[PDB]
Amino acid sequence: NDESKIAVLVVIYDHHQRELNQRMIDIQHASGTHVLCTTHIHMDEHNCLETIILQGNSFEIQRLQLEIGGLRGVKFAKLTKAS
Amino acid sequence: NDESKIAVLVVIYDHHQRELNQRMIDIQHASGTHVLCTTHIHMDEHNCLETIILQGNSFEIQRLQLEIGGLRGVKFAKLTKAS
Amino acid sequence: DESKIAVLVVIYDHHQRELNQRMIDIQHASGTHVLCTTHIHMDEHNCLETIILQGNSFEIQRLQLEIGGLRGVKFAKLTKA
Amino acid sequence: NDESKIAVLVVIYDHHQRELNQRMIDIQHASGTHVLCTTHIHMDEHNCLETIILQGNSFEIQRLQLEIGGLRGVKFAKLTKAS
Ligand code: NI
Numbered sequence: 001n002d003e004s005k006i007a008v009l010v011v012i013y014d015h016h017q018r019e020l021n022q023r024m025i026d027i028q029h030a031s032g033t034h035v036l037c038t039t040h041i042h043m044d045e046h047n048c049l050e051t052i053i054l055q056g057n058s059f060e061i062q063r064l065q066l067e068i069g070g071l072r073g074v075k076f077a078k079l080t081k082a083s
Numbered sequence: 084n085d086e087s088k089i090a091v092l093v094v095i096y097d098h099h100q101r102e103l104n105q106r107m108i109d110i111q112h113a114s115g116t117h118v119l120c121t122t123h124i125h126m127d128e129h130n131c132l133e134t135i136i137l138q139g140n141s142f143e144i145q146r147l148q149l150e151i152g153g154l155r156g157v158k159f160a161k162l163t164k165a166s
Numbered sequence: 167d168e169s170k171i172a173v174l175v176v177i178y179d180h181h182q183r184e185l186n187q188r189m190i191d192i193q194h195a196s197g198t199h200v201l202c203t204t205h206i207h208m209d210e211h212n213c214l215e216t217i218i219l220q221g222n223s224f225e226i227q228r229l230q231l232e233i234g235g236l237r238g239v240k241f242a243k244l245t246k247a
Numbered sequence: 248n249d250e251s252k253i254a255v256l257v258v259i260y261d262h263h264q265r266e267l268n269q270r271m272i273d274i275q276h277a278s279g280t281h282v283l284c285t286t287h288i289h290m291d292e293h294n295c296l297e298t299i300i301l302q303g304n305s306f307e308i309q310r311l312q313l314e315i316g317g318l319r320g321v322k323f324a325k326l327t328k329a330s
């Protein structure tokens with residue numbers, strides 16, 4: 001794209017999954033200003049929910065989505081695209 | 084239904100609308116949802132983004148979503164059913 | 167002139183006429199100084215906010231005195247880092 | 248009377264540090280405090296800031312704080328006591 005957008009990626013994962021947290025955070029740190037913040041909810045022993053606020057064009061954003069959303073031990077990864 | 088469910092309500096609204104932040108907060112205090120928390124981004128002079136994280140039976144989540152969505156100044160008020 | 171990050175922790179009563187407008191107006195007119203806010207609705211008359219702030223120690227302290235002095239704020243403490 | 252209370256724990260840490268993100272998350276899931284939520288700012292390549300919002304008695308909170316305070320790679324870990 002070029003068109004500048006805001007989005008939320010809602011994630012459910014198990015933090016017991018070996019190296020998952022390391023991957024998700026390295027992806028977000030390596031993505032520059034694309035990631036505004038994350039809010040985390042410790043649901044139970046094997047479920048975390050995260051809302052990851054994202055900003056950029058539609059293509060940068062879906063790509064971030066697919067990176068985080070494909071990792072092993074991610075149960076659920078859904079984009080809400082806003083503007 | 085009769086159980087525990089997690090949802091994320093994603094809202095974009097105009098904080099220039101008279102009383103709007105105050106009404107959105109009160110709807111949340113008054114609700115028999117347990118709102119776990121709300122994260123807010125001041126996107127610009129006319130746009131705020133909130134991710135409101137909710138727990139409850141579907142009826143109450145849905146009542147929250149409609150009630151927020153029915154406020155003048157809300158531009159976008161979309162729910163992600165997670166859980 | 168050194169850029170720093172800070173958390174302003176606020177408790178206030180949302181039933182206070184116009185406190186919410188004033189707080190959000192301050193933050194919106196503060197440019198890139200506010201990163202985000204996280205809100206917990208404690209009970210009928212208490213909200214806790216965690217307001218995350220970025221700038222020099224002066225710009226930050228001002229921001230603090232601005233939110234911090236509004237009528238209806240019970241508590242306004244700054245963590246510097 | 249019985250004394251469940253609110254606190255904010257503010258943490259700066261190095262996400263490069265070997266499995267620090269997993270361990271902090273793990274400490275949070277395993278504690279007897281109610282962690283309401285964690286907000287995370289990716290500050291730069293070596294710095295993450297978290298705001299951990301907590302509810303419980305002063306003992307379990309102080310336990311959480313000292314425990315996060317003692318992981319290698321955590322750089323700053325101040326509690327703010329609320330009510
Ligand atoms: Ni968790």
Ligand code: NI
Nearest residue numbers: 124125126131
């Ligand atoms: Ni705003």
Ligand code: NI
Nearest residue numbers: 108206207213
């Ligand atoms: Ni509130």
Ligand code: NI
Nearest residue numbers: 288289290295
């Ligand atoms: Ni980070």
